[PDB]
Amino acid sequence: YESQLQMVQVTGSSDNEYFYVDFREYEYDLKWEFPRENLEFGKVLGSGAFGKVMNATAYGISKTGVSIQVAVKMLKEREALMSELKMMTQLGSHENIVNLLGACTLSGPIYLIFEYCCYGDLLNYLRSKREKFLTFEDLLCFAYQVAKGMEFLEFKSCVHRDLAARNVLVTHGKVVKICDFGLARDIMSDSNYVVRGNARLPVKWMAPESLFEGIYTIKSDVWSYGILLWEIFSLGVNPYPGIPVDANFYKLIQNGFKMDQPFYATEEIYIIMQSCWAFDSRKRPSFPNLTSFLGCQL
Numbered sequence: 001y002e003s004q005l006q007m008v009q010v011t012g013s014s015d016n017e018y019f020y021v022d023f024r025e026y027e028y029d030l031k032w033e034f035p036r037e038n039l040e041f042g043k044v045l046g047s048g049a050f051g052k053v054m055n056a057t058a059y060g061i062s063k064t065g066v067s068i069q070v071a072v073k074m075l076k077e078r079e080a081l082m083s084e085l086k087m088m089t090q091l092g093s094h095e096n097i098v099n100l101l102g103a104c105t106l107s108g109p110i111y112l113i114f115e116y117c118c119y120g121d122l123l124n125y126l127r128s129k130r131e132k133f134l135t136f137e138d139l140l141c142f143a144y145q146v147a148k149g150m151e152f153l154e155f156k157s158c159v160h161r162d163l164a165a166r167n168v169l170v171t172h173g174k175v176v177k178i179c180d181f182g183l184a185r186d187i188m189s190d191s192n193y194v195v196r197g198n199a200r201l202p203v204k205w206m207a208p209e210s211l212f213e214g215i216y217t218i219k220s221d222v223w224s225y226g227i228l229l230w231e232i233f234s235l236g237v238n239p240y241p242g243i244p245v246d247a248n249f250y251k252l253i254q255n256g257f258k259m260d261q262p263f264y265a266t267e268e269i270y271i272i273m274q275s276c277w278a279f280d281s282r283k284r285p286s287f288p289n290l291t292s293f294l295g296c297q298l
Contacts, residue, residue: 001050001075003084003180004162005153007091008217015281016215023086024079032089034061034102034113039072045120046184051075053184055116061101069116070101073183074109081110084180088112091156096149098169098179117169117177125170126236137298139232139264142168142176144294149178150225151287154218161216163224164205165231166192192238194245204239208253208279219281225290226276233269234262268297 007021038059045053054072062068075081088100104111119125122142126134146168153160160167160178166185168176187193193200207223209215227239240259243249258277261270272293278284285293 001080001183003087004167004182005084005087005158005160005178005180007087007156007158009157015209015217015219016213018217021087023083023090026086028082028086028103028105029089032085032100032103033106034058034104036104036108036111039070039104039111039113040067041072045071046181048183048186049076049188051081051183053181058101058113061113069118071098071114071116073112073114075183078110081112085110085112091158094149094152095175096145096177097152098177114179115171115177117171119170121166121181122168122170122176123165123231123236126165126232130235133235133264136264138174140269140294140298141174142232143229143269144291144298145176146178146225146228147287147290147294149176150218150221151291153178153221154287159216159218160221160224161210162202162205163221163228164192164202165228165236168228203245203249207281209281211250211253217281218287219284222276222284222287222290223281225287226273229265229269229273229276230259230262233265235264237262266297 008018009021011017011019040057042055042057045055051074054074056070056072057067058070059067061070073081082105085103093099098117099115100112101115102113162180162182167181168178169181170176187200192202192204194203203211205224205227207220210220230239256279258274261267265273272290275285
């Protein structure tokens with residue numbers, strides 16, 4: 001298990017000159033410690049091979065002496081989860097990120113407590129609304145919000161190695177938040193991940209430099225973001241629909257193959273998508289760039 005949301009530290013001007021920040025040697029700030037008895041567990045939000053994410057009510061975790069809904073990450077009946085915890089305590093909060101609220105790490109199994117998103121992952125949300133088109137303005141708003149969340153991550157020197165609609169969650173006012181919900185799903189039962197030794201790769205969302213060099217930068221995320229845009233404006237269709245993942249898929253990407261304009265996208269949005277898929281990472285737009293284009297389109 002490992003969160004795909006990771007902090008990195010750039011070492012050179014070249015894309016591959018950076019390393020991942022590992023919080024294993026850092027210390028956990030106990031001000032985040034929450035009483036596990038103040039958690040009232042509800043339904044399972046999703047489960048997988050390593051553990052699961054549970055819904056629950058938390059007594060007094062919020063600034064007020066009120067009880068609220070939260071999402072609790074946990075492992076199958078550890079250091080990796082502690083590192084994710086430490087990492088999220090250092091990130092700071094943002095409206096378009098699923099924020100950490102607390103943790104239980106001392107008198108029992110490790111629990112990471114996050115903000116709860118009542119309407120599940122954005123992919124299922126979109127698919128559940130194919131027969132009820134939610135408006136185009138909402139679509140543009142989801143897009144703008146994800147760009148803003150990614151802009152925050154870029155600012156905090158982080159990258160998401162699995163950016164996709166399945167890792168974006170929806171809450172009350174049509175607000176979406178980026179996270180890593182990998183713990184809440186069985187990667188083995190998800191065909192969007194291709195098995196390769198010890199890796200489970202979301203090939204159809206990967207930038208060429210990630211596919212062919214194992215490189216992951218904020219620019220690679222701009223590419224994945226373009227795929228996520230296609231997911232939004234097609235209402236949740238699998239990317240490169242009908243095309244299998246095999247040696248020919250890799251060759252297609254290498255040759256510059258790009259998806260067609262999805263039905264709900266306008267030509268301006270599609271032009272943005274296409275630029276996100278520039279083979280050369282330098283040619284792709286930046287997130288602050290994308291946030292403006294979209295803010296404007298809005």
